């Protein structure tokens, strides 16, 4: 894995949005949006979050993520963290992650990341807790089925 960042572009749009494979994976990453998932909802995410970013391994767009939280001086909250199907497994979470992390120290000189997750999601509360994320607190919400889940609330300082 040979690994490299930038933001993300509009030509980006298409396969990232291609990235959420069911509804579970859509509202694991992004809750509000409804399925089947489009361009135009992850454009407007990207309108109204900060730190829009890509990974790429040979050629390929592989990860995606933002901040839907930041505050000057303060922490970011990491958002809408999606992997091609294909690259699940390969260190592109864990990689875009640290990027994150980076970013938000040098540009909102946070102190801490906070990383919400779902708790059906194990693959990601296991990622965070191996990075360093602990968890804060749970919080109720519902699902598109008016079901109830647990949002499990981290947080990691930053260094
Ligand atoms: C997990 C997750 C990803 C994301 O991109 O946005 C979120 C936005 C959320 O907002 P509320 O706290 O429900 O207002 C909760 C969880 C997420």
Redesign the pocket.
């Given at each position: 894995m040979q690994l490299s960042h930038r933001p993300a572009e509009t030509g980006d749009l298409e396969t990232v949005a291609g990235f959420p494979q069911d509804r579970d994976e859509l509202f694991?990453?992004?809750?509000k949006a409804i399925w089947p998932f489009s361009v135009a909802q992850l454009a407007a995410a990207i309108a109204e979050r900060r730190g829009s970013t890509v990974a790429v391994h040979d050629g390929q767009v592989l990860g995606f993520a933002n901040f839907?939280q930041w505050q000057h001086g303060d922490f970011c909250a990491l958002?809408?963290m999606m992997v091609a199907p294909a690259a699940r497994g390969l260190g592109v979470a864990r990689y875009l992650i640290g990027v994150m992390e980076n970013l938000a120290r040098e540009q909102y000189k946070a102190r801490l990341m906070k990383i919400?997750?779902?708790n059906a999601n194990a693959a990601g509360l296991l990622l965070y807790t191996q990075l360093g994320y602990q968890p804060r607190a749970i919080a109720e919400?519902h699902d598109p089925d008016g079901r109830r889940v647990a949002?499990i609330q981290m947080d990691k300082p930053l260094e």
């Open positions: 694991y990453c992004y809750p839907y958002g809408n919400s997750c779902f919400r949002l």
